[PDB]
RNA sequence: AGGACCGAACCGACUAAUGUCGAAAAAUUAGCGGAUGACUUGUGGCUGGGGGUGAAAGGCCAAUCAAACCGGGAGAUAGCU
RNA sequence: GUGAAGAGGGAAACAACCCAGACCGCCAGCUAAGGUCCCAAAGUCAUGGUUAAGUGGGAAACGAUGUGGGAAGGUCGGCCUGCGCGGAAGA
RNA sequence: ACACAGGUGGUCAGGUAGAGAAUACCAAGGCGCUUGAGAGAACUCGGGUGAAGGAACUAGGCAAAAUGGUGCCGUAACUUC
RNA sequence: AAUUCCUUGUCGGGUAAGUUCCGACCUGCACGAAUGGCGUAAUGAUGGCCAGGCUGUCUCCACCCGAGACUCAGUGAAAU
RNA sequence: CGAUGUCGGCUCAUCACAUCCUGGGGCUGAAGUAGGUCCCAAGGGUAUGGCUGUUCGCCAUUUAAAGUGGUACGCGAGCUGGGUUUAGAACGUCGUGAGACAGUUCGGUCCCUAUCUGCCGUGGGCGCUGGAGAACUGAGGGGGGCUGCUCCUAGUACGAGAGGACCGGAGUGGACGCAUCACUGGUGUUCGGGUUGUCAUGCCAAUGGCACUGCCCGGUAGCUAAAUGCGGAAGAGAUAAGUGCUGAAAGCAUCUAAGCACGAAACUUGCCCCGAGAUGAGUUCUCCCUGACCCUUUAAGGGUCCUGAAGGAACGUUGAAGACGACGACGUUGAUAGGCCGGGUGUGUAAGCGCAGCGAUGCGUUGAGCUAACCGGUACUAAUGAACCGUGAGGCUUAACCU
């Protein structure tokens, strides 16, 4: 459950360190964005050797939430914060080369792969 | 097809072996006894008449009594109509049990909901409550404008107004049939149904094939 | 938030048609003090279903 | 949306509908009879029915809990010795409602509550 | 009401240890792709347990590389395949949500003896 | 030592809600400023209406003030209703 | 000229439009404007034509003709005309 | 104007915790506020709690929420020091 | 600019986006030296803007606790 | 002008179509994709923010779009009071001045208990032609008729290349609506525990009162969303724009004047709900009522005694029904409520005793004690009567059917 104006911490290398997003993509009148949603987000802080520099516009997808997961057995799989990983604006591939913490098994697709392979664990 | 007349007992899970947990509602489903079967030579449309459950003799009614003897089955709960499609035919005093439900997929149930009383505009129509603060004064939840000033100068019918809110016939259409047994008298639909524990609900196979 | 005409005694007693009073009728008497009582209350000298329930 | 909930409240805080129930039940095993308000009566029955069951067990235990909810020791030591023993033959349902009339002040449905033993 | 009850005891598993809140645990599930099915181990700290018959669930906290990960199980769902109990927490409360806030070596759960 | 600081009594009245045929013809509640001083208060006295007094707002002068209240000229006058 | 200061009948309703100036009464007759299938009083009257659009019963530039009538030129092309059609969208 | 949630000068003022005449519970002392009984709808008033987000509401962080004590360490620009 | 109509002047900063704000330019409709000009530490229930924590302010409201509302007994207004 | 009291915003809408999207077509400087224009079509949908009081506007980011208007530039006896347009004060300009402004700035009281119409709900009286208990038919009325993306067809037709279809099917989303707590949660001042200060129960221990539930920690049932299921349809009839077949007037041609076939989220059904006050008051099933006297204007008359049934109502226990009514369950031939027993759940190892520790506390008894609204039993208590209402076969003509 992600909305608009909702700081997130970024679980990638590319250089951003808190990122709030915009916009929730997706739909008209949308609100909220569960994992493996695409958002529209704006970096607040960022290290200075970084891909991205501080203020840019760019997307990215939730893969860690506090308000969790629903697997189909009806068990539920809550984080400590509200991550994401950074996109390319327009090709939606990630910007970094290395994924940071746990991620969720939603991102099991043809474009969220590469992050599903670079991630630490999937639980 | 026709429908049958049930017990809403409550709600449940079943676990699949693929590790789905399916949320369902228990509905039991007693053999239903048909007391009266209209044609269109008497009663200008065909359909039967059905009781289920039980009831004693102090508590059944002399009209009622003798309605149930001239049918010749035990007095049940209440009385339901189902309208018969062009082909099938029952016969008085028929047991229907729950075979029926063995083929269909989807079917529709129908019940009273539960009763909210004297709702505002907030819970039944869904109204955008007004603000709590910025000097709001004795308008938190109240419902605003009604109408526009003198052209109309009147209130449309059917304005979303608080009043009565629930304890009416909802139907919900095309619950998928999880599981259906006989010598229980269960009837086990994925979802919700409207009602209390306790509840009349008339299932029926889905119309929206 | 007034009225603009004033109501008639018309509209006055039909209002005050549907606000009567009525008459209580399970009016019971006990088996054994035979006196006058409420149904499923005691009577005023202690009785109920003939049995001196208060002194 | 009183939707199977239980107890009136009586146009009472937590505190003081305890408070009046604690000293209704004092004063109905005190005296073994009294007379109150019709709604009253069927919550002192709920209040004190389960002191009399706790009176019928005995134990230091039962005492303490009895003392904290009535705090009396007359009270406490009469639902242990009189009424501890005499209701060990019922299971339950130790009071007896007997609605009087209305009261003459307020026009309230007035009611004799009292043990069923008393005779 | 019988029916429910039976319908949940014909459910429930047989094959479920006892463990209070705050022992450490290890749940093995199974997590399936197409046909391939693996037994995948998540050992993390019961914070909260809820006994409803076969609606029973428990909550079990693990923390992970970079944060601090909360997963609740049904008891009896078939997703679960094993439950073992390494540590036994020598808590005294229901639910230890604050654990959450905890986040350190405070804490850290004594251990019990029998 | 301080027209010093925080904060009760005391004095005042910055914000919001309630109240607006009010509990009150100016309040209540929650917060608020001063609180040894150009402070506050009790008793008595003086200044009287084109006058008083005013750390000055045309503010206050008995719930009334760009001229108090009462009585009189007076049945002012009204091309207005 | 009417209303103002004039009621009555007509134009559905409509001071100022049309007919007509109320002294009073009558359960009598004749008319004006306007009308005569029913609402709603009186012609489903008579004779000779037109319209096919509900035109009548909201309108123009212009467009096509759909038909009716008349006078002309070598069966056929032009002229004037009556009723029509489209243009014609609002809470 | 009321048997009015207002105003009204001075004296005495105890126990425990507390810096304290604040405050919380008590002593002496005095009260339960002159309409009540039930019901436990909308809505209003005064409060409590709240998933995920945290000013995205609004003219405006209005209102609420938040901080809040004692002892020790440490404490920037600027400055009339 | 508490002063600027044009004007939301132009440039830089802040914000994803800033008619407000901050620092400058002077093209000052229509600043200016005791009707004081420019700075200025401290102070302000003063005006404008930004940041952190915080939260039902909102997303979008949910439940609960008391007082009315509602019903029964008594008393019993008002503007119009 | 003996008052129609506001520019904007919020809540709430409603209509029109000169249509923003979705839908159907015509032409194309329409290869396809994507577009340009025009016609039909109002069923639905038709943003969140930064700036400003702003409507408007500029800018950031999505989708199918962020439509144009009317309704006192809708909406203040519904809310705010930012601007404008009171009284204080200041700046620039103007005038000697009081003061004023094609201006700017700071601050500045928004009353009304709803009589009538209207609307949302819910009742009482009567009618419906003997009375009563049920189940329905359906004249009529109301609500959703929103849609993205991906995949298959298919890298197919088309196309120099690059790109890339129509028709059809399937899957998965956003918004909206309906229902329910099985899951996840929230609340749960009626459940359990911790703890501060103080007062009391003589005291220790143990409790209780107050301090916002004193402050907290969890949390049953109910209620609820963020949670979970379902819905938008398919089909049929008649069509709009449009496409036609056959076809004369007019020996040809022509979609039309005769006749016939297609043709849209539009209209009527189909889906859901209300619904016989539908005074046009409908249909079906069942139950109950089968006495004697008098009189007068030969009345569809009243009265006398006896009967007053089927059923309803009152009263009591009450409910996942409820403002009050109403609705439902039960009333001893009973599980309706309370209690009790057993269980479940929650809090979490009660009190007392013993041991260790001279001394805070720990340890065993012990997953103990206590447990509301939940589940299953149990008449222990409370639901006392044919007591009240409601009756004695139900009007005239005709039409068929037996005298
Ligand atoms: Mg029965
Ligand atoms: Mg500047
Ligand atoms: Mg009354
Ligand atoms: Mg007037
Ligand atoms: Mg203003």
Redesign the interface.
């Known amino acids: 459950m992600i909305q608009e104006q909702t700081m997130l911490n970024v679980a990638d290398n590319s250089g951003a360190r808190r990122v709030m997003c915009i916009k929730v993509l997706g739909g008209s009148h949308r609100r909220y964005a569960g994992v493996g949603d695409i958002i529209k987000i704006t970096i607040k802080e960022a290290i200075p050797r970084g891909k991205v520099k501080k203020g840019d516009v760019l997307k990215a997808v939730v893969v860690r939430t506090k308000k969790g997961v629903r697997r189909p057995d009806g068990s539920v799989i809550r984080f400590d914060g509200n991550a994401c990983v950074l996109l390319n604006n327009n090709s939606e591939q990630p910007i970094g080369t290395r994924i940071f913490g746990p991620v969720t098994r939603e991102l099991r697709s043809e474009k969220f792969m590469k992050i599903i392979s670079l991630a630490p664990e999937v639980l | 097809m026709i429908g049958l007349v049930g017990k809403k007992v409550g709600m449940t899970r079943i676990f699949t072996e693929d590790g789905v947990s399916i949320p369902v509602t228990v509905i039991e489903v007693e053999a239903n006894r048909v007391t009266q079967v209209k044609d269109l030579a008497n009663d200008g449309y065909r359909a039967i008449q059905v009781t289920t459950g039980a009831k004693k003799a102090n508590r059944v009614t002399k009209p009622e009594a003798g309605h149930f003897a001239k049918a010749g089955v035990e007095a049940g709960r209440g009385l339901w109509e189902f309208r018969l499609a062009e082909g099938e035919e029952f016969t008085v005093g028929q047991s229907i049990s729950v075979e029926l439900f063995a083929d269909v997929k989807k079917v529709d149930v129908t019940g009273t909901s539960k009763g909210k009383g004297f709702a505002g505009t907030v819970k039944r129509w869904n109204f955008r409550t007004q603000d709590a603060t910025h000097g709001n004064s004795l308008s938190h939840r109240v419902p605003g404008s009604i109408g526009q000033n003198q052209t109309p100068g009147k209130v449309f019918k059917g304005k979303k107004m608080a009043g009565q809110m629930g304890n009416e016939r909802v139907t919900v259409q095309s619950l998928d049939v999880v599981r259906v047994d006989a010598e229980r008298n269960l009837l086990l639909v994925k979802g919700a149904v409207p009602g209390a524990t306790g509840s009349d609900l008339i299932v029926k196979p889905a119309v929206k094939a | 938030a007034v009225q603009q005409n004033k109501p008639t005694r018309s509209k006055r007693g039909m209002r005050r048609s549907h606000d009567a009073l009525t008459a209580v009728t399970s009016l019971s008497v006990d088996k054994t003090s035979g006196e006058k009582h409420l149904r499923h209350h005691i009577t005023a000298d202690g009785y109920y279903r003939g049995r001196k329930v208060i002194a | 949306m009183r939707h199977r909930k239980s107890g009136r409240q009586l146009n009472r805080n937590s505190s003081h509908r305890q408070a009046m129930f604690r000293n209704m039940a004092g004063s109905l095993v005190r005296h073994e009879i009294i007379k109150t308000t019709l709604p009253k009566a069927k919550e002192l029955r709920r209040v004190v029915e389960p002191l009399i069951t706790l009176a019928k067990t005995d134990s230091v235990a039962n005492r303490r809990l009895a003392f904290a909810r009535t705090r009396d020791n007359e009270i406490v030591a009469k639902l242990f010795n009189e009424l501890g023993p005499r209701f060990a033959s019922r299971a339950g349902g130790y009071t007896r409602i007997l609605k009087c009339g209305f009261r003459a002040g307020d026009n309230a449905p007035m009611a004799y509550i009292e043990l069923v033993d008393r005779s | 009401?019988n029916?429910?009850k039976?319908?949940?005891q014909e459910?429930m598993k047989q094959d479920v240890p006892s463990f209070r809140p705050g022992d450490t645990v290890e749940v093995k599930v199974?997590?399936?792709?197409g046909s391939k099915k693996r037994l995948?181990a998540?050992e993390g700290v019961v914070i909260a347990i809820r006994n409803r018959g076969?609606?029973s669930?428990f909550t079990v906290r693990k923390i992970?590389?970079?944060?601090?990960?909360?997963?609740?199980?049904?008891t009896?769902?078939?997703?679960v395949d094993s439950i073992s109990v390494k540590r036994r927490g020598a808590v005294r409360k229901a639910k230890l949500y604050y654990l959450?806030e905890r986040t350190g070596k405070a804490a850290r759960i004594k251990e019990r003896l029998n």
């Open positions: 009401s029916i429910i039976q319908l949940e459910q199974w997590v399936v792709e995948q998540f076969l609606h669930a992970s590389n970079g944060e601090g990960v909360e997963r609740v199980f049904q009896h769902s078939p997703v959450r």
